[PDB]
Amino acid sequence: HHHHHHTDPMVSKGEELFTGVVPILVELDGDVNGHKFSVSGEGEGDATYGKLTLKFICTTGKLPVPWPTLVTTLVLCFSRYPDHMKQHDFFKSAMPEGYVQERTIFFKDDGNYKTRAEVKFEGDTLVNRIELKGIDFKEDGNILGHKLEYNYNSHNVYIMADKQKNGIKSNFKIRHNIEDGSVQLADHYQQNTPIGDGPVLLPDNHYLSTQSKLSKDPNEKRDHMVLLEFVTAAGITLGMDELYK
């Protein structure tokens, strides 16, 4: 699994927290053009396989934006980092004290989300607590008019160190499929910083390869999303010239 046996005791510490299946709670408070809503999510993460299983419920009634637009906002510490890359796993290294994750998400020709989250352990539970603010949306556009398909694409998200912040940054493009066959671009800008003052791992440039499947619970009457997601780190090669040459 294993996941204690690394020569680096800092790596060992972070990896230990994510051995096995870890329960997850997600809490989001949102306001988009004054449309207020809340989401609660539950499930588990198995970082050894890069695997996330989560069910989200809108606890205020009808979600006023399409569920796919919230996927990126609603725990990259469950990414599978290859053994030769484990020195570049910022997310696990910040645990259990945790990290702040902040984004601005620009929906092209529409409004923007600004998000601030804190991701940390509460006992055995990995908790993602989020505030989301959206402004300048078209009230009958693709987001507030619910014109997006209920599905999700696969991505390569590039991570860079942000050294003077002692953290990381990323910018990446998500396309949401529009029901007429077109696409709604959501351009993501992201930064993460540790919550503790302890040492963290600042990574070399690399990327996260993501894939997500959205489904519905056939017995659930509340507005909700079921998410099955896999995330794997990649983009750094090993030695020696090469192991397989």
Numbering used by the authors: -8 to 65, 69 to 239
Give sentences from the paper.
Notably, methods such as RESOLFT (REversible Saturable OpticaL Fluorescence Transitions), nonlinear SIM (Structured Illumination Microscopy)5 or pcSOFI (photochromic Stochastic Optical Fluctuation Imaging)6 exploit reversibly switchable fluorescent proteins (RSFPs) that are able to repeatedly toggle between a fluorescent (‘on’) and a non-fluorescent (‘off’) state. In so-called “negative switching” green RSFPs, the on-to-off transition competes with fluorescence emission upon illumination by cyan light (~490 nm), while the off-to-on transition promptly responds to illumination by violet light (~405 nm). However, the development of RESOLFT nanoscopy in live cells necessitates RSFPs that switch efficiently even at low illumination power (to minimise photo-damage), display minimal residual fluorescence in the off state (to maximise contrast), and are highly resistant against switching fatigue (to sustain a large number of successive on-off switching cycles). It was found that variants engineered from fluorescent proteins of hydrozoan origin (jellyfishes), and notably from the well-known EGFP, could fulfil these requirements, giving rise to rsEGFP15 and rsEGFP216. To shed light on the switching mechanisms of rsFolder and rsEGFP2, we solved their crystallographic structures in both the on and off states.
Models were refined at 1.45 Å (on state) and 1.50 Å (off state) resolution for rsEGFP2, and at 1.50 Å (on state) and 2.35 Å (off state) resolution for rsFolder, respectively. The photophysical properties of rsFolder and rsEGFP2 are highly similar. As rsEGFP2, rsFolder is an efficient negative photoswitcher, both in purified form and in live cells. The two proteins display almost identical absorbance and fluorescence spectral properties. The pKa of the rsFolder chromophore (pKa = 5.5) is slightly lower than that of rsEGFP2 (pKa = 5.9). In rsEGFP2 and rsFolder, on the contrary, no such reorganisation of H-bonding networks is observed and the structural changes are restricted to the near environment of the chromophore phenolate. A similar situation is observed in rsEGFP2, where His149, playing the same role as Ser142 in Dronpa (distance to the chromophore phenolate: 2.7Å), finds Tyr146 as a surrogate H-bonding partner in the trans state of the chromophore.
